[PDB]
Amino acid sequence: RTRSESTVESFFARGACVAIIEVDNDAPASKLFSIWKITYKDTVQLRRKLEFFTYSRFDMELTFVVTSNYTDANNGHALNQVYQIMYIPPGAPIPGKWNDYTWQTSSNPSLFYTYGAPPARISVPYVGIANAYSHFYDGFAKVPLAGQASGDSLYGAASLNDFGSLAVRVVNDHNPTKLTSKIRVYMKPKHVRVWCPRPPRAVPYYGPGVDYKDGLAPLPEKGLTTY
Amino acid sequence: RTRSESTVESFFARGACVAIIEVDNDAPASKLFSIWKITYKDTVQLRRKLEFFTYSRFDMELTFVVTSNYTDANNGHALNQVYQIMYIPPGAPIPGKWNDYTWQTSSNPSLFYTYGAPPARISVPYVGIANAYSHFYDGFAKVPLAGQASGDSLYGAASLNDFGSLAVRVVNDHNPTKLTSKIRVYMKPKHVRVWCPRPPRAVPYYGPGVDYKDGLAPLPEKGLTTY
Amino acid sequence: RTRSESTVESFFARGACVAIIEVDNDAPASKLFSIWKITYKDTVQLRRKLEFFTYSRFDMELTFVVTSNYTDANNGHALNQVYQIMYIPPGAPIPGKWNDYTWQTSSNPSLFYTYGAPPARISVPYVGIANAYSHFYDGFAKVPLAGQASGDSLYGAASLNDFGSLAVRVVNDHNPTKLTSKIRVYMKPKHVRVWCPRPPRAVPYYGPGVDYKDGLAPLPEKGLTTY
Amino acid sequence: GLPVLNTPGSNQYLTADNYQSPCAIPEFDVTPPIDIPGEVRNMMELAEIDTMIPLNLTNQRKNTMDMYRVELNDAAHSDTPILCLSLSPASDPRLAHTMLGEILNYYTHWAGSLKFTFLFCGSMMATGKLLVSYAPPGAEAPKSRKEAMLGTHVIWDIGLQSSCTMVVPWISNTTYRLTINDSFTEGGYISMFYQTRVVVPLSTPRKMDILGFVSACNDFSVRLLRDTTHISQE
Amino acid sequence: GLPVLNTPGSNQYLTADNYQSPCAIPEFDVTPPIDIPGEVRNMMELAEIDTMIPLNLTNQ
Amino acid sequence: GLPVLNTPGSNQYLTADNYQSPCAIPEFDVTPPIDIPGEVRNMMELAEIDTMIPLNLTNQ
Amino acid sequence: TLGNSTINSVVAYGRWPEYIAVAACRFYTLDTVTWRKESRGWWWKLPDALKDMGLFGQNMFYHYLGRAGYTVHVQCNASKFHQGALGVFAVPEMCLAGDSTTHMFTKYENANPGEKGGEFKGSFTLDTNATNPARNFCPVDYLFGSGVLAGNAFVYPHQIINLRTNNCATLVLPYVNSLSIDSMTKHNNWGIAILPLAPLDFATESSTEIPITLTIAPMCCEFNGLRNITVPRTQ
Ligand SMILES: CCCCCCCCCCCCC/C=C/[C@H](O)[C@H](N)CO
Ligand SMILES: CCCCCCCCCCCCC/C=C/[C@H](O)[C@H](N)CO
Ligand SMILES: CCCCCCCCCCCCC/C=C/[C@H](O)[C@H](N)CO
């Protein structure tokens, strides 16, 4: 009996949903474009699996599953939509309107997806500025100095997990009818290395940190002398 | 004259329908998701072919043929649907709602199918916890013990044929119009080995066991001295 | 000048239409499934080409071109249809209803075609029970014996050209609107060998045999001493 | 990318195709096989096993054990047949539901020799000689021992041995026969007659039973897998 | 997978094409051929046979 | 181009598949790894560590 | 000879029993049954039939896991003026149909009768008592008790006792299972079915009865998982 399926590679060799980005195709209450900051902490399953360890390196595979629907019955028909997903690394200009110049994406990587096509997919290598990703950071970005007023940075927040965002829009000019679309993002780590195992999360997550608020009594009742 | 087409491989080298899973795409009398327990005993033809033998090993190929239709005439149009089929191995959490967290499928294998694409297809190896599958099990899961009240397990039922389930939903947000879909599951055993041939079933099947209730007089009348 | 295009292979290297099978997608005057007995004698061109010879061997390539249409204007829309074509070899149970168990096709070869896809195509080898196909059979299946009442089999009819049938249905559940579909079957013999050339048919075909009824005066008038 | 052209047949699902597909459970550690007794490699191996023939399918016998027993008695010699069978191993109702017939009903074409064994189940004090005959097809079915004697046949002495096997060798115009009732591929006739009568002493049962078994020989083969008519779902 | 580009002519059915297709009856044991008299390899072999000319195509 | 035939399973997304995809950041100069203590290769290595059992799961 | 017990043969699937206790595994004689003219057949389960046999039953109930092959010897003698035939079939995983509209409703105490075994019926009777269901097997002889034609039961390892020829049958059954070793109290590896293929007859006597005796020796026995004694519930 070998341990092939319990290797770290096999443990993480699954596409996990991390985001549902919602966009609308409508004439300018609607949202003609959406910005999603790239993280695995919006969901729980992949986060709990990753937080078995303190540090990690891996490449990432992103898959995009796109669904769409009409909002009103017999309101009319629509032609097949094209979606733009633009990666905005930290520092790049962020779109402020559906039609602003930033969508020209001369230097930003961009993906154009045609509805009805198989889910889109890209891969990226290990992009951390440190030698590994930090699942936990016990420190501050700024040390407050004597003389400073009431260096107030949040606990655990550091730019070592700042990877930019995804800006998503519908490229088509707006139909006479309103359409709603959702893009589901699935992450798969590849070529994984991990360090410093930790006990798994036992209570519900509360925020991007390790704070807990509710569900603090997980274990059930079981008699000591009862099998 | 060779016996190439009567080998055990050739005898089972066909995709046989084993299930018709029905789902609906409607606003929340409808069924927005369906759970099907994985078995070949919902149909008869493949079951009868397999029960020529007592034990078997093989890999399995699953093919999914998806069809859909509107429920009402001229009620409106719909955008192309995406279907999620998630394998839930025994012990994994079972979805209770269309939108519950379990669909994130961080560790469960999942398949996303786009309507109009060729039927979906996956393969799995021999996954039995024993050294072979048991088509027949002459025993109980629990032995009732003296002292126990009125170990009452069903005859022949054992966890050696428990392979989990398939949870099927439509990923798209619900259209203004009601849509109905059916997913037909086709099984093909591959690399088959079989042991202990048995006489074939002669009367209609009745339940997952060998019980019989009706049609107990299969043979017709034929004179002894009539060709 | 070589004779490459007059070889027997080149003479038959064309897909010839042999059948137009009509099916309907409607709620249960309609025909929700159709049975077509496999033969090349429903059409004339391929039959006349084949009947240049007495005996033949070849593999067969079948191509299926599927077309469909609405029956009423503005009656509504429909989702893309899936068609099942099941080969029923002689002796296999024949479907009697659109939804009967036979469509599970555990042992029958079956083909699922998605509308809008390129025409479907399969190949079969030489499947004759004799050493060659018989285009002509000068005999009976039964010899009537003295003592028998008024062995009455048809002249020329023998089971040496019995190859089963094709059962065709629409897999989708029935739309609110009526749809009509036609499947055109195109045959191409391959790796052809032929024996015993015959004079070509000169008058219109009448039935599966060599009988003639009409058009018995094919040749025109032409003066003997006129160029 | 690489220039490609989609040929006809693209995107079809043929249930008899043989293609690769992605594995849904990668890196699974499969349980190794053990040496289980009774492995089968070919369905013909099951057709080569003798199984009892339900010969006596009368109104009062069918769907009971009595349908397997053919009664002999010690009456005076006669030329009337004891049993008559058509050599249609998949469509004759008496052979269709044996193991051989059940295997044959999953295929369209069959060829090869057959083996018919008959077991005499009377007392040890019983004697008699029987004639077992195969007539190839084409003529009227034999209705007396005179006509049956002209075909292939064997003489069975029950006193000498209680079980006797007649091999029906493969004799056909076509290379294969159909597994349905078809005149062009008819098989012939199997018949049983009294060669002498059955003789018993006093204080002995005067009626006894014989049983019939059929199997395929090593030259048997089948073709064109198909669905059976022996199972249906409602 | 492998990067591919669909050229024009994709998804067409040309009745004169020569392509492979899947076998619908795998592992079929084909009946061997016998030596039948009168085999033909080329249709010109039939055109090289003398046949009678209907020369007198008058009304009667 | 090259004659091809799309088999069933084309255009599906299986979350357990293992396929190549295009790189969205080509020519990225990846930071090399360092020798961090406590590397893990197999989850069973974590299961081989003794952990305390909550044996006394009574109400109080 | 096996142990202190002493005395054609058929080796099931041509495989002699083999290892992957020693004294306990010997020939044991079950209770004799009476073959009558109207008898329909008998069945037993192995290792269930031997559960109260000396040290073998003790080892069965003291261990979690056990495996064994068997040697089954059927004994039935009559005169040269008797006629009749028995078929003795050894069936791996011999599941028998129940008697109720509920699937797989046969209770453990009825599925494991012991050395007495059970009898086949000529026809199927449906148990209708709903307040107190019988939850017993209803095995029909011509359906071989499992919905298959008895005429094809000859695909199983088998012997025929023809009264005019022989009076005994010997079947050597190796351990057959999807596992190398299993629980002997949860699972019966083998079933023995004896059906009258030809009815018993004796001249001018509609009263004749003859005994049939079964002697079974477990072989190549292995036990593992010694713990306290298992005491199954009885009815
Ligand atoms: C052109 C279409 C968009 C494709 C580009 C996708 C964005 C590029 C990847 C940025 C995200 C880096 C991977 C993230 C790693 C995890 O967050 C770390 N484990 C954090 O600790
Ligand atoms: C991600 C999409 C779903 C793909 C995963 C499919 C489920 C995995 C296979 C589970 C079923 C195992 C094969 C079953 C074997 C038969 O039931 C045995 N012969 C039972 O005796
Ligand atoms: C699974 C989809 C259906 C594919 C199977 C197609 C049917 C199999 C082929 C049967 C027909 C055999 C070829 C026929 C040959 C001609 O009829 C002979 N020349 C007759 O003389």
- The total number of residues shown for chain C amounts to 227
Contact B76, A74 (CB under 8 A): yes
Query: Reduced to 3 states, what is the DSSP secondary structure of residue C29?
Result: coil
What is the chain E residue with the closest CA to D221? E29
Gaps in chain B (C–N > 2.5 Å) come after which residues? 28, 150
Q: Chain-centre distance of CA G93, in angstroms? A: 11
- Chains B and D make contact, 3+ CB pairs within 8 Å: yes
What is the chain D residue with the closest CA to E32? D175
Strands (E), G136-189: 158-162, 168-173
* CB contacts, 8 Å: A67 with chain B: 79, 81-82, 171-173
Contacts of G74 (CB under 8 A, 6+ apart): G86, G88, G159, G161, G168, G169, G170, G194, G212, G213, G214
* Separation CA G61–CA G51 (nearest Å): 8
CA pseudo-torsion sign E4, B113, D21, E19: negative
Label residue G223 left, alpha or beta by phi (over 0 means left) and psi (-120 to 50 means alpha): beta
* Separation CA B101–CA A44 (nearest Å): 9
* Separation CA G81–CA G61 (nearest Å): 46
Label residue D27 left, alpha or beta by phi (over 0 means left) and psi (-120 to 50 means alpha): left
Contacts of F26 (CB under 8 A, 6+ apart): none
Contact A35, A221 (CB under 8 A): no
- For residue A118, report the distance from its CA to the centre of ligand 1, in Å: 21
CB atoms within 10 A of CB B213: 18
Phi, psi of D211 (to 5 degrees): -125, 145
* Separation CA D93–CA B220 (nearest Å): 7
Chain B residues 5-34 with CB within 8 Å of chain E: 5, 7, 10, 13
In the 8-state DSSP scheme, what is residue G151?
A: G
Candidates C39, C26, C42; CA nearest to C166 is C39
* Separation CA B111–CA A14 (nearest Å): 11
Q: Looking at the CA of residue C62, tell me the nearest atom of ligand 3.
A: 6
Ligand nearest to the CA of B129: 2
Phi, psi of D66 (to 5 degrees): -60, -20
Which residue, among B6, B21, B184, would best test binding to C if mutated, counting the most C CBs under 10 Å from its CB? B184
Q: Which of C163, C168, C169 to mutate to test the pocket of ligand 3 (most atoms within 8 A of CB)?
A: C163
Candidates G98, G51, G63; CA nearest to G182 is G63
Tokens of A111: 């993906």
CA pseudo-torsion sign G37, G40, G45, G48: negative
* Separation CA G169–CA G157 (nearest Å): 12
The CA dihedral of C197, C202, C207, C213, to the nearest 10 degrees, is -140
Query: Reduced to 3 states, what is the DSSP secondary structure of residue B103?
Result: helix
* Separation CA A17–CA A20 (nearest Å): 8
Q: Residues with Cβ within 6 A of ligand 2? A: B 38-40, 56, 60, 62, 85, 87, 109-111, 122, 124, 127, 133, 135, 161, 163; D 24
- A18 Cβ below 6 A of ligand 1: no
Contacts of A96 (CB under 8 A, 6+ apart): none
Candidates A37, A123, C127; CA nearest to D109 is C127
Contact A125, F30 (CB under 8 A): yes
User: Between vectors from CA E10 to CA E6 and to CA E11, what angle results, nearest 5°?
Assistant: 135
Q: Is the peptide bond before G47 cis (omega within 30 degrees of 0)?
A: yes
* Separation CA A35–CA A94 (nearest Å): 9
Which residue, among C26, C71, C74, C106, would best test binding to B if mutated, counting the most B CBs under 10 Å from its CB? C106
What is the chain C residue with the closest CA to B71? C176
CB atoms within 10 A of CB B94: 12
User: Would you call C137 exposed, middle or buried from its count of C-beta atoms within 10 A (0-12, 13-18, 19+)?
Assistant: middle
Candidates G22, G12, G66; CA nearest to G181 is G66
* CB contacts, 8 Å: E36 with chain C: 55, 131-132, 195-196
Contacts of C68 (CB under 8 A, 6+ apart): C25, C81, C115, C179, C180, C181, C182
**Contact status of B133 with chain F (Cβ, < 8 Å):** no
* CB contacts, 8 Å: E26 with chain B: 5, 10, 13
* Separation CA D54–CA D62 (nearest Å): 8
Ligand nearest to the CA of C194: 3
Phi, psi of B5 (to 5 degrees): -85, -5
Contact C195, C53 (CB under 8 A): yes
**Contact status of E29 with chain B (Cβ, < 8 Å):** yes
CB atoms within 10 A of CB C50: 20
Any alpha helices (H) in A28-171, and if so which ranges? Answer: 45-50
Contact A33, A23 (CB under 8 A): yes
β-bridge mates for residue E4, sequence order: D2
* CB contacts, 8 Å: F17 with chain D: 22
**Contact status of F4 with chain B (Cβ, < 8 Å):** no
* Separation CA G172–CA G8 (nearest Å): 11
Query: Reduced to 3 states, what is the DSSP secondary structure of residue C101?
Result: helix
* Separation CA D137–CA D174 (nearest Å): 13
- Which amino acid residue places its CA nearest to atom 1 of ligand 2? B110
User: Cβ–Cβ of G15/D37 closer than 8 Å?
Assistant: yes
In the 8-state DSSP scheme, what is residue B106?
A: S
Q: Chain-centre distance of CA B219, in angstroms? A: 30
* Separation CA C107–CA C92 (nearest Å): 9
Ligand nearest to the CA of B187: 2
Q: Which of C35, C102, C133 to mutate to test the pocket of ligand 3 (most atoms within 8 A of CB)?
A: C133
**What's the one-letter identity of residue B42?**
D
Contact B45, C107 (CB under 8 A): yes
Taking the CA of residue B120 and the nearest CA in chain F, the distance in Å comes to: 4
Contact G161, G168 (CB under 8 A): yes
Query: Reduced to 3 states, what is the DSSP secondary structure of residue G61?
Result: helix
**What's the one-letter identity of residue C163?**
F
Q: Which of B12, B54, B104, B124 to mutate to test the pocket of ligand 2 (most atoms within 8 A of CB)?
A: B124
- A127 Cβ below 6 A of ligand 1: yes
Candidates E54, E33, E59; CA nearest to C199 is E54
Contact D2, E5 (CB under 8 A): yes
Tell me which method was used to determine the 3D structure. Answer: cryo-EM
Rounded to a whole number of angstroms, the distance between the first and last alpha carbons of chain A is 29
Between the CA of residue G63 and those of B140, B159, G24, G185, G220, what are the distances in Å?
Answer: 17, 21, 14, 10, 16
* CB contacts, 8 Å: F4 with chain E: 4
3-state SS string for C162-209: CCCEEEEEECCCCCCCCEEEEEEEEEEEEEEEEEEECCCCCCCCCCCC
**Contact status of D22 with chain F (Cβ, < 8 Å):** yes
Q: Chain-centre distance of CA E43, in angstroms? A: 12
Any alpha helices (H) in chain A, and if so which ranges? Answer: 8-11, 45-50
**What's the one-letter identity of residue C116?**
G
**What's the one-letter identity of residue E53?**
I
Query: Reduced to 3 states, what is the DSSP secondary structure of residue C82?
Result: strand
- A35 Cβ below 6 A of ligand 1: no
Strand C82-88, strand C16-25: pairing: unpaired
Contact A110, A88 (CB under 8 A): no
Choose among F1, F5, F20: nearest Cβ to E7: F1
Which residue, among A5, A67, A114, would best test binding to B if mutated, counting the most B CBs under 10 Å from its CB? A67
- For residue B47, report the distance from its CA to the centre of ligand 3, in Å: 29
- For residue A64, report the distance from its CA to the centre of ligand 1, in Å: 13
**What's the one-letter identity of residue A87?**
Y
Which residue, among D13, D147, D231, would best test binding to C if mutated, counting the most C CBs under 10 Å from its CB? D13
- Which amino acid residue places its CA nearest to atom 19 of ligand 3? C133
CB atoms within 10 A of CB B225: 13
Contact E40, D232 (CB under 8 A): no
- The total number of residues shown for chain A amounts to 227
Query: Reduced to 3 states, what is the DSSP secondary structure of residue D103?
Result: helix
User: Would you call G128 exposed, middle or buried from its count of C-beta atoms within 10 A (0-12, 13-18, 19+)?
Assistant: exposed
Where b means 16+ CB within 10 Å and e means fewer, D121-139 reads bbbbbbbbbbbbbbbbbee
Strand D13-14, strand C110-114: pairing: antiparallel
* Separation CA D50–CA D100 (nearest Å): 8
Strand D109-111, strand D177-178: pairing: antiparallel
Choose among B105, B114, B119: nearest Cβ to F15: B105
Contact D16, E24 (CB under 8 A): yes
Contact C83, C170 (CB under 8 A): yes
Candidates D68, D48, D49; CA nearest to D58 is D68
User: Cβ–Cβ of B125/D81 closer than 8 Å?
Assistant: no
Contact A182, A22 (CB under 8 A): yes
Candidates C21, C20, C22, C19; CA nearest to C71 is C22
Any alpha helices (H) in A4-98, and if so which ranges? Answer: 8-11, 45-50
- For residue B164, report the distance from its CA to the centre of ligand 3, in Å: 41
What is the chain A residue with the closest CA to D24? A14
* CB contacts, 8 Å: G171 with chain D: none
* Separation CA B64–CA C203 (nearest Å): 51
Where b means 16+ CB within 10 Å and e means fewer, E32-55 reads eeeeeeebbebbeebeeeeeeeee
Contact C47, C39 (CB under 8 A): no
* Separation CA C9–CA C115 (nearest Å): 32
Between the CA of residue A19 and those of A41, A189, B79, B224, C203, what are the distances in Å?
Answer: 9, 16, 22, 75, 73
What is the chain A residue with the closest CA to B115? A116
**For G107, what's the count of Cα atoms within 13 Å in the CB-facing half-sphere?**
16
What is the chain A residue with the closest CA to D32? A1
- For residue B19, report the distance from its CA to the centre of ligand 2, in Å: 12
CA pseudo-torsion sign F16, F17, F21, F23: positive
Candidates G130, G133, G143; CA nearest to G43 is G143
